[PDB]
Design an enzyme around this catalytic site. Structure first.
Site, PDB file in Angstrom:
ATOM      1  N   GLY A 191       3.996  -5.411 -15.495  1.00  0.00           N
ATOM      2  CA  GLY A 191       3.017  -4.441 -16.002  1.00  0.00           C
ATOM      3  C   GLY A 191       3.703  -3.386 -16.860  1.00  0.00           C
ATOM      4  N   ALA A 192       4.903  -3.730 -17.361  1.00  0.00           N
ATOM      5  CA  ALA A 192       5.823  -2.830 -18.102  1.00  0.00           C
ATOM      6  C   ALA A 192       5.263  -2.172 -19.376  1.00  0.00           C
ATOM      7  CB  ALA A 192       7.085  -3.593 -18.464  1.00  0.00           C
ATOM      8  N   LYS A 193       4.145  -2.711 -19.865  1.00  0.00           N
ATOM      9  CA  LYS A 193       3.301  -2.036 -20.831  1.00  0.00           C
ATOM     10  C   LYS A 193       1.995  -1.626 -20.158  1.00  0.00           C
ATOM     11  CE  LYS A 193       5.493  -4.061 -24.909  1.00  0.00           C
ATOM     12  NZ  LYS A 193       5.130  -4.380 -26.318  1.00  0.00           N
ATOM     13  N   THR A 230       1.373  -1.080  -6.758  1.00  0.00           N
ATOM     14  CA  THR A 230       0.036  -1.583  -6.894  1.00  0.00           C
ATOM     15  C   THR A 230      -0.758  -1.260  -5.616  1.00  0.00           C
ATOM     16  OG1 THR A 230       0.730  -3.288  -8.467  1.00  0.00           O
ATOM     17  CG2 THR A 230      -1.279  -3.765  -7.133  1.00  0.00           C
ATOM     18  N   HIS A 248      -6.200  20.410  -8.145  1.00  0.00           N
ATOM     19  CA  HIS A 248      -6.247  19.307  -9.077  1.00  0.00           C
ATOM     20  C   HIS A 248      -7.099  19.652 -10.255  1.00  0.00           C
ATOM     21  CE1 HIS A 248      -5.012  16.693  -5.677  1.00  0.00           C
ATOM     22  NE2 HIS A 248      -4.483  15.990  -6.664  1.00  0.00           N
ATOM     23  N   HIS A 249      -6.742  19.140 -11.434  1.00  0.00           N
ATOM     24  CA  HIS A 249      -7.599  19.245 -12.620  1.00  0.00           C
ATOM     25  C   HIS A 249      -9.062  18.892 -12.340  1.00  0.00           C
ATOM     26  CE1 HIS A 249      -6.575  14.930 -12.500  1.00  0.00           C
ATOM     27  NE2 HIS A 249      -7.851  14.824 -12.825  1.00  0.00           N
ATOM     28  N   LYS A 280     -11.320  15.341 -11.835  1.00  0.00           N
ATOM     29  CA  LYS A 280     -11.080  14.508 -10.688  1.00  0.00           C
ATOM     30  C   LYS A 280     -12.316  14.201  -9.887  1.00  0.00           C
ATOM     31  CE  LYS A 280      -8.278  13.575  -6.655  1.00  0.00           C
ATOM     32  NZ  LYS A 280      -7.100  12.679  -6.811  1.00  0.00           N
ATOM     33  N   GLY A 286      -7.094  11.882  -1.797  1.00  0.00           N
ATOM     34  CA  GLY A 286      -6.594  10.958  -0.780  1.00  0.00           C
ATOM     35  C   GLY A 286      -5.408  11.540  -0.047  1.00  0.00           C
TER      36      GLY A 286
END
Lengths: 247, 247, 247, 247
Positions: D8-10, D77, D133-134, D137, D143
């Site tokens: 998933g490196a991109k 993941t 948090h911004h 959200k 969580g």
């Protein structure tokens, strides 16, 4: 509302401001300039106000020009000796339909902090400053920190106060920060952080802390719009957003 | 400087104020009263200003008296419906050599906090409140918290603002604090703590936090002296230390 | 649960501990001693554990005594060179039914803070310390501060780390705190405050701050009870509450 | 040191990790994968450890594969029901030369915070949580917040504690946060902010606050490297970075 041009509109800085205009409901974005490209273009496009970030070499020129063609300007370019202020002052005599604002800082939080600290200082015997910033940073304490402290020191000298209580029998070097007109200022370099101030005031039984925090290189933009949305009622030359805030 | 009497001078509260006077260079402590003992004594002793903490039953009486004999008064007694204000207003017509001050709060830090938050609110899209207090406390949120928030809400309604950004898809009960004229207010009860507020303001890239902290039941005293040292130039009736602060 | 005596039970300190016992459900308060009055009394009353705050002149004696008659002891008296530790160690050989604990600090918050900082230090490139205290205070930085920093420095030298990032081109004197085994430590003297630490750790994208706050001269007491409630399973000599905490 | 591939490196996420490897002295970056392109390539290139961020559809497959060819894996993941854990557990029987780590969080600060709070909880009567948090959200509380609180609640139920002191005579709705296994949790949405927690603990005379602050979407990376630099000595399956930290 307002038609607006930007100079230096391609820097990091430019882009953020560009966007901020579009995004804004009440501000039509009416130009963009490389750095030294042709200013005429402002008038052609009928700009009411400009935001300028040009190399201090250019800046004075565009200024003259803007003033000459009645356009007001919000400047965050650095490098304004009192000579340069005096130039501008001179440019502006008997116009009263055009303004300049020179804000050495546009971080409202920062500005407000500066401001409130001055207002608060007369009531508290103790007062110190702490400043924190990513570790890359070249200089300690931050400029902002230093200004804060001077302003505090002012408010105290005026409204004649003493020096503050500190029964420290020979303290360790470094440990009580840098004295700045008698105000301790502590500089903290911390990986992960960005830019932050924190001003503590002390009296019997209590404290008041005012702390500003920038999370992100683009905190200037709210500054700049406060400028733009109001220069229109501050003809002549002003230095410091504090004055636009109506406090 | 000033000659000063105290009413209710034997409560917890009394003692701290008593001392604060003596300790002060510029204030001669000129009386003391049990609660309902003979007021005459003030005049006999030639008091210029009094500090009053009497049961709301007594208070109105001593007030009348003080005003009648030209003595100004700094009141922190609670229980002042607009009827009672109206009484006092009436007591005070055409004197302009005597004042009253009614401070529902004397914690300067707290007051200043209230004040600054009002001034700041117009610049930040987000704004919340957090309040913290020892666990014994009877009511949540604190009165002070609530006032803060209302004052913020005011400053926003005036200078017409929207409601604030919050993309919360069905939040959990309790989790976003109590709404107070659209201002979230969070109440934290924490063993070890005393009394503390904290007001956060949010905009693009930045925040401003103003936080007050009382370490100790006696934080009112600096309040009270600001009163005493200045009532002398605020004839008539004033409500709220904010007004004595000259902001 | 436990029967308990107190030595130096009439100091400021004494009283608070006295009470803390009574108040506690599981601890019967079984004695009290002026300073040098007759210790016998402990045995007469059948005390399982003592809490000691005696002048370092007395302390060693009562210690010997307590150990001799199988009573365990929780000591917060200062002045324990390694000679004195060695004395005690010697007193204690082959007993394993009796303990001593010497806690140079009993502020759990403080202790835990010390502890966690050591645990955390290996993960963050940056780490600084800030310490704050009423202005009367004689020495800067606080002892606690200094210990914290050393412990951090330890954890880093072990688990071999570099020095930390700081691109400060000639900083202003004082401004980067006192170096303490390469750890910046900032000392803040602030009227209204009591005693507070704050340890900041920095890495890519983030920080961790651990901050301890004492509101009140009596924060040692929870310490002391943790001692008392557990010495019973830590025979021999221990130095530092950290060890009783089971971490 | 180590040869390393990324899956998933991109994504946004990928790039930051990619870089983090190169930048690192002791880690040779040995591959990159679109999402579903051919895994073989790892072996061809001789990778010792992989970092995986693939859609939960793919993830289980690459996992099997990696394990089969002896490569250890650091997974961030999401989507790992106990079925999926059970799958992996099964994949891993009698290998003891290969590991997996599943970190539902890689923000060390956050993790450490979780951790320390659990350790601290047994000593303080009061304990609350505040999360910020911004405003974008979606959910409140975060969580992370919720987990924190549960973990605190655990540590208390174990080491059997009561509920906490709160003399609040009918509090206002919302004002005491959301109860989470008896732990108040306050959620603050604030323009300008990013992601932040703050856990307060209360006892007689004192508090301990542990507060984590992310300034920037990329705080996971230090997490991930702690993983990579150590999986090599944690064969089998582990869930939670906490376990790699050696505390």
């Amino acid at each position: 509302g307002i038609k607006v041009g930007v100079l230096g509109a391609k820097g990091r800085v430019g882009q953020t401001i560009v966007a901020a205009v579009n995004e804004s409901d009440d501000l039509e974005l009416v130009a963009e300039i490389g750095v030294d490209d042709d200013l005429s273009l402002l008038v052609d496009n009928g700009a009411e106000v400009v935001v300028d970030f040009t190399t201090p070499n250019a800046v004075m020129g565009n200024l003259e020009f803007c003033i000459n063609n009645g356009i007001s300007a919000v400047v965050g370019t650095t490098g304004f000796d009192d000579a340069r202020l005096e130039q501008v002052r001179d440019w502006l005599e008997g116009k009263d339909n055009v303004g300049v604002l020179i804000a050495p800082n546009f971080a409202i939080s920062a500005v407000l902090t500066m401001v409130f600290s001055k207002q608060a200082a007369r009531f508290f015997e103790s007062a110190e400053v702490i400043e924190l910033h990513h570790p890359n940073k070249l200089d300690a304490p931050s400029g902002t920190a230093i200004h804060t402290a001077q302003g505090i020191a002012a408010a105290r000298k005026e409204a004649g106060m003493d020096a503050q209580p500190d029964a420290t029998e020979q303290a360790l070097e470094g440990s009580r920060g840098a004295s700045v007109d008698g105000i301790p200022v502590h500089a903290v370099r911390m990986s992960g952080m960005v830019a932050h101030e924190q001003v503590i005031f002390g009296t019997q039984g209590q404290t008041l802390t005012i702390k500003q925090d920038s999370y992100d290189r683009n905190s200037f933009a709210p500054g700049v719009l406060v400028g733009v949305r109001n220069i229109a009622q501050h003809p002549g030359l002003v230095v410091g957003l504090e004055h636009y805030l109506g406090l």
